Each structure stands twice: as C-alpha cells, then as structure tokens.
Amino acid sequence: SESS
Amino acid sequence: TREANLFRTVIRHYEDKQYKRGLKAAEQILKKNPKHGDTMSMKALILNAQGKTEEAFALAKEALTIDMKSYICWHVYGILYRTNKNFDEAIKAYKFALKLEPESHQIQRDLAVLQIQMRDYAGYVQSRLNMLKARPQIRQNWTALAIAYHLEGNLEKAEHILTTYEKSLTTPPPKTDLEHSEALLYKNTIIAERGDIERALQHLETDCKHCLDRLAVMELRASYLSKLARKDEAAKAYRALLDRNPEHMDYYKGLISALDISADDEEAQKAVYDEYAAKYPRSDAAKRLPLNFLSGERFRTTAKAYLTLMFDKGVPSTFANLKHLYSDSFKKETLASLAEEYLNEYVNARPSGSKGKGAALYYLAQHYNYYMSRDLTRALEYVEKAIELDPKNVDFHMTKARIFKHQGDLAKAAETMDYARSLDPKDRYINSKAAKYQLRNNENEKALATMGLFTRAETAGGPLADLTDMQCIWFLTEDGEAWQRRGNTALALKRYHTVFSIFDTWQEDQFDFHSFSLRKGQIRAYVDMVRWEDRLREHPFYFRAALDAVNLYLSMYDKPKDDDPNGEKLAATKDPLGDAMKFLNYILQFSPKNIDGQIAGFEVYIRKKKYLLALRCLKAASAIDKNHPKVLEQAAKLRKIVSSALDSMAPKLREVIQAELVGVP
Amino acid sequence: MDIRLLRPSDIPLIQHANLENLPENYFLKYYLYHALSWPQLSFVAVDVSRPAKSPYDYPKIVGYVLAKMEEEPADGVPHGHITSLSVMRTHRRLGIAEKLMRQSQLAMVETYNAHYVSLHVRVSNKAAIHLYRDTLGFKTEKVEAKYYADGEDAYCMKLDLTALREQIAAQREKELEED
Amino acid sequence: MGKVDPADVNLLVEELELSKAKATELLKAHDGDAIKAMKAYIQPA
Ligand SMILES: *C(=O)CSCCNC(=O)CCNC(=O)[C@H](O)C(C)(C)COP(=O)(O)OP(=O)(O)OC[C@H]1O[C@@H](n2cnc3c(N)ncnc32)[C@H](O)[C@@H]1OP(=O)(O)O
Numbered sequence: 041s042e043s044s
Numbered sequence: 045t046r047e048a049n050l051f052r053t054v055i056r057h058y059e060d061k062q063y064k065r066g067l068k069a070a071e072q073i074l075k076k077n078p079k080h081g082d083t084m085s086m087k088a089l090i091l092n093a094q095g096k097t098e099e100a101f102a103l104a105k106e107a108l109t110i111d112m113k114s115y116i117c118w119h120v121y122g123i124l125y126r127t128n129k130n131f132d133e134a135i136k137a138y139k140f141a142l143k144l145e146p147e148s149h150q151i152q153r154d155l156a157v158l159q160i161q162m163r164d165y166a167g168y169v170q171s172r173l174n175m176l177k178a179r180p181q182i183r184q185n186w187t188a189l190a191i192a193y194h195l196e197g198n199l200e201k202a203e204h205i206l207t208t209y210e211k212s213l214t215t216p217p218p219k220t221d222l223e224h225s226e227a228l229l230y231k232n233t234i235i236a237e238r239g240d241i242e243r244a245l246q247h248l249e250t251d252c253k254h255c256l257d258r259l260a261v262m263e264l265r266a267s268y269l270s271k272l273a274r275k276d277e278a279a280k281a282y283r284a285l286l287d288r289n290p291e292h293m294d295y296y297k298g299l300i301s302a303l304d305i306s307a308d309d310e311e312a313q314k315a316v317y318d319e320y321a322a323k324y325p326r327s328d329a330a331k332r333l334p335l336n337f338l339s340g341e342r343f344r345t346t347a348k349a350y351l352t353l354m355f356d357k358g359v360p361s362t363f364a365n366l367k368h369l370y371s372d373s374f375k376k377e378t379l380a381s382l383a384e385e386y387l388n389e390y391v392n393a394r395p396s397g398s399k400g401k402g403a404a405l406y407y408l409a410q411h412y413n414y415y416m417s418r419d420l421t422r423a424l425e426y427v428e429k430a431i432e433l434d435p436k437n438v439d440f441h442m443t444k445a446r447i448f449k450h451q452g453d454l455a456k457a458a459e460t461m462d463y464a465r466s467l468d469p470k471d472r473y474i475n476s477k478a479a480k481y482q483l484r485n486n487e488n489e490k491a492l493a494t495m496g497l498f499t500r501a502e503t504a505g506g507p508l509a510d511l512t513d514m515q516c517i518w519f520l521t522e523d524g525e526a527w528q529r530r531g532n533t534a535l536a537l538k539r540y541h542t543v544f545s546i547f548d549t550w551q552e553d554q555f556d557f558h559s560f561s562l563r564k565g566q567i568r569a570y571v572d573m574v575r576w577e578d579r580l581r582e583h584p585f586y587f588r589a590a591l592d593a594v595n596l597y598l599s600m601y602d603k604p605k606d607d608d609p610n611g612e613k614l615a616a617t618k619d620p621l622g623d624a625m626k627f628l629n630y631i632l633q634f635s636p637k638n639i640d641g642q643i644a645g646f647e648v649y650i651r652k653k654k655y656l657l658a659l660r661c662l663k664a665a666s667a668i669d670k671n672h673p674k675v676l677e678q679a680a681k682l683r684k685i686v687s688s689a690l691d692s693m694a695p696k697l698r699e700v701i702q703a704e705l706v707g708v709p
Numbered sequence: 710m711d712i713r714l715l716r717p718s719d720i721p722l723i724q725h726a727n728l729e730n731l732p733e734n735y736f737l738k739y740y741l742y743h744a745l746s747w748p749q750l751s752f753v754a755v756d757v758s759r760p761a762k763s764p765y766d767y768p769k770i771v772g773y774v775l776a777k778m779e780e781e782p783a784d785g786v787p788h789g790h791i792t793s794l795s796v797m798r799t800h801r802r803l804g805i806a807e808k809l810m811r812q813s814q815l816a817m818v819e820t821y822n823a824h825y826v827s828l829h830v831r832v833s834n835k836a837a838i839h840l841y842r843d844t845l846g847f848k849t850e851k852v853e854a855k856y857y858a859d860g861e862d863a864y865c866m867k868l869d870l871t872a873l874r875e876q877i878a879a880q881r882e883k884e885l886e887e888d
Numbered sequence: 889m890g891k892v893d894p895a896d897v898n899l900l901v902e903e904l905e906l907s908k909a910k911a912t913e914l915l916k917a918h919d920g921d922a923i924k925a926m927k928a929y930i931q932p933a
Binding site: 222256257258259260288289291292293326328329357358359360361364365368438439470471472473474476498500501514515516517518549550553554557560561564566568569570572573576582583584585587634635637638 | 710711712713714716717718720721724725728729730731732734735736737738741744745746747748749756757758759762763764765766767797798799800801802803804807808812815816819820821833834858859
C-alpha cells in the first residue's frame with residue numbers, strides 16, 4: 041500500500 | 045493612459061496574490077473614475093479571494109450593471125459563481141462573456157467544462173464544435189466532439205466525427221499508439237450501442253484486432269459472437285477468456301451456453317469445470333462452482349472433497365465462500381454433516397498442526413450462527429471448542445462476539461469483539477469491527493478512541509476529523525445512529541449532513557476529468573464514469589444516512605472556519621420538514637423502487653399539507669407492495685384528510701386526488 | 710467470489726474496503742484518477758451470490774487491487790506500481806490477492822509493456838510479504854525508513870516481468886501462425 | 889406550440905413543488921391539460  | 049497601465053498592475057498584483065498591492069492600486073483608479081466597471085470587477089475578485097464573498101458578489105453585480113457589454117465583468121461574475129459551486133449561474137455568465145469576446149480560448153474552455161458537468165448536452169456540443177473549429181490539428185478536440193454527441197444521444201453523429209478523423213490520417217498509426225487504440229475501441233462500442241452487432245464484430249476483427257486493451261477485444265468478441273448465435277466460435281472465445289481468468293463466473297456460463305449443454309445435464313457441465321480445474325489447479329472457481337448445480341450424492345461427494353482441501357489448509361473463510369448454497373436446504377444440511385464427518389475423521393497432522401480441526405469447528409460455529417441455519421446455543425459450543433484449541437485466534441473470538449450480538453447481548457458482544465481486536469492490534473479490519481460493535485452498544489466516545497488507533501496521529505480535530513477527511517461513511521452513519529439513539533439530535537444530524545456533503549464532493553470530483561480524460565485518451569472509462577455519476581446517489585451509502593435524516597426531522601416535527609461544529613444550529617431548526625427536503629428529493633428521485641423511502645416521503649408530505657405529492661408516494665409504495673402494513677395504514681390515513689380538507693383545495697386538485705385515490709387502497 | 714475488472718461505479722465500495730482493511734487511505738478522487746488513467750490494471754473480488762437487501766445494491770466488494778503505470782519511467786523503461794491491495798478479513802486465504810495480482814500484472818505487460826512491477830509493504834506484514842515473495846516472486850530492493858504515517862519501515866519490492874513478457878510473446882507467435 | 893393557463897402553472901408549482909419552468913414544461917407536455925398532467929406525474933415507473 042502507498043503511504044499518506 | 046496612466047490608469048490604463050495601472051489597471052494592468054492590478055491584474056499583475058492579483059496573479060501574484062498581492063491583494064494589498066492591487067487594491068491600493070485599483071482604489072486610485074476608482075477615485076478618479078468611480079464608474080469604471082472593469083476595475084470594479086477586478087476588485088471584486090480580490091475581495092472574493094479573501095472571504096469577502098457577499099461583498100464581492102454585490103460589487104461584481106454592480107459592475108456589470110455599469111458596463112453590461114464588458115466581457116471582463118461577466119467573466120468575473122462567472123468565476124465567483126463557479127467558486128461558490130453554483131455552476132448553473134456560472135454557465136449563464138460565461139456564455140455571455142463568450143458572446144462578447146468570442147476569441148477568448150479560456151472562457152470557451154471553462155464554459156465547456158461547466159456545461160458537461162451540468163449535463164447541458166446541447167451546450168457542450170456547440171462548445172466542442174467551436175473548440176474543434178479553432179484547433180482541428182489536435183486529435184483530442186475531435187474525440188471530445190464525438191463524446192459530446194455520444195452523451196447527447198446522437199450516436200450516428202458521434203461515429204461520423206470519429207470516422208472523419210480516421211479518414212484524415214495519411215499514415216496508419218503504429219499499434220503502440222494507445223490514443224489511436226482507445227479511439228478504435230470507443231468507436232466500436234458506439235457501433236454496438238447503435239444496435240448493429242453484425243457491423244461491430246466486423247469492425248472489431250478488421251480494425252481493432254491488435255488494440256492494446258486485450259481483455260476488451262476478447263470480451264467484445266465473445267459477446268458479439270454469442271448474440272449472433274455463432275456458437276462454435278463463441279465457444280472458442282469464452283475458452284480464451286477462461287484461460288485468461290479462470291475465476292470469472294460468466295465465462296463458464298458463456299462457454300456452457302455455446303456448447304448447447306442443458307442446465308439439467310449435471311454431469312456434462314461438470315466435465316467443462318473439471319477440465320479447467322485440471323488445467324488450473326489453483327482456481328477455486330473451477331472446483332467450487334459445480335456445487336451450484338450438483339445435487340444428491342454427486343453434490344455430497346464433490347462437497348466432501350472440496351471441504352477436505354480447505355479444512356486441511358486450515359482456511360477460516362471456507363464458510364463465507366460456501367454460504368450462498370444455503371438457499372437449498374439439502375446442501376445446507378449436507379455441508380454441516382460433512383464438516384461433522386471431517387471432524388470425526390481428523391487426526392493431528394504434524395504430530396512430531398491442528399488447523400484442520402479448528403477450521404471444521406469454526407465452520408460449524410458459523411453454520412449455526414447463520415440465520416438460515418441458526419442455532420445460537422450450538423454455535424456457542426462449537427466456537428468455544430475452537431477457542432479451546434486456538435485461544436489466540438482472532439476470527440474465532442470475532443465469531444463468538446457475533447453470536448452474543450444475535451443473542452441480543454450487545455455489551456458482551458462489544459467486550460468480546462474488542463478482546464478479539466487486542467489479539468491483532470496491527471489489523472484494521474478487526475479494529476473497525478470493535479468500533480462498530482461499541483457504537484452498536486451506544487458507546488460513541490469509546491468507539492471513536494478505538495478508531496483513533498488507526499487514524500493519523502496529529503490530525504487536528506482528532507480521529508473524527510481524519511475520518512471525515514477520508515470520507516468514511518460507514519463510521520459517520522453508525523456514529524449518527526448511535527447519537528440519535530442516545531437522544532443527541534444535534535450530533536446525529538451533523539453526521540447525516542456530513543454524509544450528504546461527501547456525496548456533493550463525489551459529484552464535484554468528476555469536474556477536472558472532463559479535460560483530463562481527453563489527455564489520457566482512455567475514453568470508454570470516461571463515459572463509464574459519467575454514466576455512473578448520473579446515478580450517483582442511488583447508492584445505498586447515500587440512501588441509509590439520508591433516510592435517517594428524514595426520519596429524524598419527522599420526529600423533530602412531532603416533538604417540538606467550520607460553523608456549527610456540533611450541529612446545534614441544525615437541531616434548533618424552526619423548519620425541520622423544510623430541512624428534510626434536500627435529503628428526501630434524492631431519495632425519491634434516485635431510489636424510487638425503495639418502499640422505505642416512499643413511506644417516509646408520504647409522512648413528510650401530509651405534514652407539509654401537500655396531499656398530491658403524498659398520493660404520489662403512496663401510489664409508488666403500493667405499486668411495490670400492495671399489502672405492506674404501512675401503505676395500508678397511510679392509505680386509510682390519507683382518505684380521512686382528503687374528505688376533511690377538500691372544501692379548501694382547488695377544484696382541479698380535488699378532482700385528481702379523488703380520481704387517482706380510488707385506484708389502489 | 711468472482712474476479713473481474715474494476716468499474717467506476719465500484720469505487721465507493723472499493724474505497725470502503727480500503728477504509729476497513731488498511732491504514733493508508735485516499736480521497737475518492739484518487740481512485741477516479743487510477744480508473745480513468747489505467748482502466749485496464751485494477752481488479753476487484755466480488756461476492757456475487759450475496760442476496761440483495763435492496764433494489765439498488767451495488768456489487769459487494771470483498772477484495773481489490775489498485776494499480777498504475779509509473780508516469781516517470783526510471784530510464785524510459787515502463788513499469789507498474791501497486792497503489793493498494795486488500796481483502797476483507799472474512800475472505801482471506803482463498804487465493805484472492807494472488808489472482809488479483811496476476812490479472813493486474815498481465816495487463817501491465819500487454820497494454821503498457823511493463824518491464825517490472827513494484828510496491829511498498831510494512832516490514833512486519835508477514836501475510837503480505839509471503840504473498841509477494843513466496844507466491845509471486847517479488848525480490849526486495851531496499852528499506853524505506855518511516856515510510857508509513859505511524860513510522861513503520863517499508864520494503865520496496867520489485868517483480869521482474871521478463872518471464873511473463875516472453876511467455877506472452879510465445880503465445881503471440883502461435884496466434885500469428887494461425888493468422 | 890402549446891399555450892398554458894397561468895393559474896394552472898401556479899397550481900402545479902404549489903402542489904407538485906416544481907419550478908415555474910418545469911411546471912410549464914409538464915403542462916405543455918399535456919397540451920395545457922392540468923388534470924391530465926397532474927395525473928400523469930403521480931403515476932409510478
Ligand atoms: C500495498 O498495497 C502492498 S501491502 C498491503 C497489503 N494489504 C494489507 O495488509 C491489508 C490486510 N491484509 C490483507 O488484505 C490480506 O491478508 C493480503 C492482501 C495481504 C493477502 O490476501 P489473501 O488472503 O487473499 O492472500 P492469498 O491469495 O489468499 O494467499 C496467497 C499467499 O499469501 C500467503 N498468505 C496469505 N495469508 C497469509 C497469512 N495469514 N499468513 C501467512 N501467509 C499468508 C500464502 O502464502 C498464500 O500462498 P499459498 O501458497 O500458501 O496459497
């Protein structure tokens with residue numbers, strides 16, 4: 041999963 | 045002439061966000077020429093760019109009075125409107141600005157966007173035709189005009205615009221050109237939507253053969269062949285898709301139809317499935333699907349072999365993957381018997397591990413918790429035996445809590461779900477379950493602190509702010525219903541209003557993509573989005589919170605930078621039925637087939653003294669369930685009111701009411 | 710559960726699935742941007758036999774993979790990136806994430822000529838790490854310290870798609886013979 | 889080409905809660921027959  | 049250059053330094057100071065440097069400048073023009081419209085408008089922008097929204101509008105409006113033929117004054121007026129999200133009033137003003145300054149590419153660009161955003165199709169077509177006339181060397185502008193025609197319902201003209209472009213090409217684009225590839229498929233879908241399946245297949249095979257979107261070509265080919273009753277070929281096509289994705293139900297349906305195999309022939313069907321199961325050992329579908337039409341011993345035998353695989357693997361999601369079969373009583377009882385059978389046959393693998401035994405006990409726990417085969421006492425026993433075997437198992441405790449829930453012990457259910465959470469503190473799913481269960485037990489402040497374990501830490505306004513930001517509708521709705529249950533009308537309404545605003549955002553989200561999709565060239569997706577957006581609020585995610593609001597306003601009617609953060613102004617309304625209308629309108633317009641909405645509408649309109657709309661709701665609800673207890677009650681309640689207030693209503697209303705009332709009580 | 714290509718109308722329930730299962734969340738608009746930029750790369754798992762409570766029930770999304778092509782190629786070399794992947798806890802260990810990943814990867818190669826695919830995963834995420842390393846063949850490239858909002862490190866993992874590309878070209882040649 | 893009675897337009901506005909534009913359009917759709925238009929409008933899909 042990609043952060044922020 | 046010094047003012048002339050001074051006017052320019054007002055725009056420069058504006059485009060540099062230097063308000064003071066620009067205002068002080070503009071004020072020097074207005075002291076000498078106080079009725080200079082262009083300057084007043086420029087000042088109106090800066091005012092709006094610093095919250096002076098009401099004042100900016102008064103000023104802009106005054107400006108275009110002074111100079112009604114200035115395209116700047118009208119442009120500004122539009123910009124303000126577009127900023128305040130009134131796209132419709134924006135369109136009127138952009139449109140006139142463009143009639144004053146037809147050379148303005150910016151004005152035409154922004155208007156066109158606004159027009160499609162509000163589904164002004166005729167307007168959008170005119171705009172794109174114009175833009176295309178101005179810049180016809182650019183392919184986007186041809187595609188855009190085709191899209192406008194397409195969305196307008198003029199499929200023939202949209203196909204014409206697409207083909208006209210293709211015919212200008214001197215050289216065939218390379219198959220690497222994704223824009224050209226997407227443009228071919230878009231035209232193909234247009235031919236089929238015109239209903240010419242024969243021609244679309246022809247165009248598919250001839251022009252679209254090597255398009256980059258491989259799945260699209262493959263699915264269109266199978267779809268067309270099947271509709272043309274070209275079965276041998278459709279068979280081959282569905283096989284191609286199955287080999288690509290053995291997990292997609294409809295490809296099996298397609299194949300099986302194409303082979304002319306009757307649904308009665310169980311064994312002939314399984315052969316197809318067994319074939320792909322052999323070819324693709326990791327496909328769950330190729331093993332599981334045959335349990336839909338298999339029956340008797342054929343079912344038991346296949347079902348045992350499937351259950352053994354899953355239990356041996358220890359899979360806890362086995363029940364969830366099979367519960368769809370429980371519509372058939374036989375398959376229901378047989379599945380439980382097989383689990384019990386496996387349980388008895390189980391020996392500890394890995395003796396020198398017991399996951400199989402846990403998995404069967406867990407299956408049985410869920411079986412008897414399921415409403416179709418519910419036996420909460422037995423379910424409890426099975427989950428406890430499972431938890432004996434595996435005490436740190438999150439899913440085991442999760443199911444246990446759910447049994448308590450069904451037993452009605454909400455307290456016990458929240459305590460147990462939270463314990464389950466504490467066993468996997470890294471997993472948000474179980475965290476979300478615990479919070480939900482706590483809200484179900486009306487512990488809002490606790491539930492919010494649970495969610496705080498996963499919301500960004502130093503967010504201002506705490507977890508609630510972050511969850512609002514991230515558009516979390518399940519929690520917002522649950523939180524509202526809980527607050528309502530505690531009697532907190534203010535926070536309940538605030539939550540429901542927040543879900544309403546999330547839907548406004550979703551509707552506004554499509555805005556930048558009218559342009560963006562033309563740059564990507566991915567046109568079919570764009571048209572998919574638009575069509576989904578046209579029915580946005582039919583989603584149960586809107587409907588639930590909205591029906592809550594309407595019910596809570598009804599209750600309030602019978603029981604007399606962010607402003608209003610706790611919705612205290614909401615609760616303090618003098619016109620609740622008026623406040624309910626924006627929720628209700630979407631309900632009735634996008635979910636008319638939903639009786640709960642119709643029943644709620646009826647209650648709102650009789651109170652509003654609008655007996656014609658009341659009847660409309662009633663006739664809808666009754667068309668859905670003639671003998672629904674509420675529609676019968678409201679039918680009888682209406683007739684009394686009608687006989688009572690009929691002297692007061694106009695004769696035409698009186699006529700329509702009594703006439704369409706006799707139809708169905 | 711059924712596996713199929715993402716639909717724009719699926720986006721609220723995809724977003725909801727992300728909210729339930731992952732600490733990394735996004736605006737709906739960001740889902741749109743994937744769906745409208747690379748409509749061929751994102752897939753969903755659907756509980757299709759879930760009985761409908763209402764005439765307007767949407768497809769019940771129990772899993773998804775959200776994928777993109779990297780707009781900035783490393784050396785002018787096209788490669789995919791997995792933005793987000795999750796399966797409802799109730800539906801894990803049915804092979805769903807594996808199927809979703811292989812569908813996305815195939816379209817990345819076919820449509821965009823992807824040379825590899827990459828992603829980030831929490832270092833403590835055993836379940837995910839075994840999927841990518843052991844089942845799918847991702848190698849680990851580096852550790853990004855405090856990548857995630859709560860400070861947790863991530864592995865940046867990468868899958869070489871050379872094998873898939875040649876495998877694809879081999880099946881392309883057999884069709885060209887038939888052609 | 890259908891002409892409409894202003895009292896009819898005001899009646900539909902008040903009793904159907906429609907904009908003057910939509911009320912008129914609905915009336916024009918039924919040849920200015922208000923009783924026909926109102927009956928049509930309250931019929932379900
Ligand atoms: C950013 O997006 C990259 S990392 C974000 C990962 N998502 C996430 O953490 C959300 C919560 N977890 C999940 O949603 C879910 O557990 C996944 C997506 C990580 C895995 O989903 P699946 O359950 O559907 O995976 P499967 O396809 O069924 O299994 C494939 C391989 O995965 C291994 N696996 C799966 N669950 C495991 C557990 N609990 N423990 C160890 N290993 C696990 C298996 O090796 C499986 O391969 P097999 O050969 O064994 O079948």
